[PDB]
């Protein structure tokens, strides 16, 4: 799968390498994070910020994460 590196807001937790598919949207992945992340953060408040920009839950990961494909560091907010 794709190495989707979920780093915490203040880097409270380290770089989390989530082996997941770009098939899903930011919403389905963020639900998946709220399950597989040991803090289990509020899906309603939490969003994914990729290298400065905001990833909305309606679009598929692939569209933004196509460029490198291999690995992507996203900051949780």
């Amino acid at each position: 799968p794709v190495t989707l590196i979920i780093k915490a807001p203040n880097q409270k937790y380290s770089d989390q390498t989530i082996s997941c598919f770009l098939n899903w949207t930011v919403g389905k992945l963020k639900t998946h994070l709220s399950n597989v992340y040991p803090s289990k953060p509020l899906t309603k408040d939490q969003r994914l910020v990729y290298s400065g920009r905001l990833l909305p839950d309606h679009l598929q990961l692939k569209d933004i994460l196509r460029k490198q494909d291999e690995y992507h560091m996203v900051h949780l907010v």
Side-chain angles (χ1 to χ4, degrees):
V2 174
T3 307
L4 188 54
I5 307 169
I6 306 301
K7 309 196 64 181
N10 298 89
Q11 190 184 268
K12 185 65 179 180
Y13 302 83
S14 301
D15 53 276
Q16 184 51 268
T17 51
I18 298 295
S19 54
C20 58
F21 288 85
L22 303 180
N23 164 82
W24 305 299
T25 60
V26 179
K28 280 58 177 297
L29 210 290
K30 183 178 56 170
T31 301
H32 176 77
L33 294 179
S34 300
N35 301 327
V36 305
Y37 198 71
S39 184
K40 299 180 61 57
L42 298 170
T43 317
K44 54 180 178 178
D45 287 278
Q46 299 295 270
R47 288 163 289 190
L48 292 183
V49 176
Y50 181 60
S51 304
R53 70 150 297 173
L54 195 279
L55 307 181
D57 62 277
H58 70 261
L59 44 64
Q60 298 72 213
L61 295 171
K62 54 172 64 183
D63 188 86
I64 315 84
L65 306 183
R66 202 281 192 193
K67 310 297 182 179
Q68 178 60 31
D69 176 71
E70 181 181 55
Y71 71 103
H72 308 287
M73 69 176 184
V74 179
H75 284 235
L76 185 60
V77 50

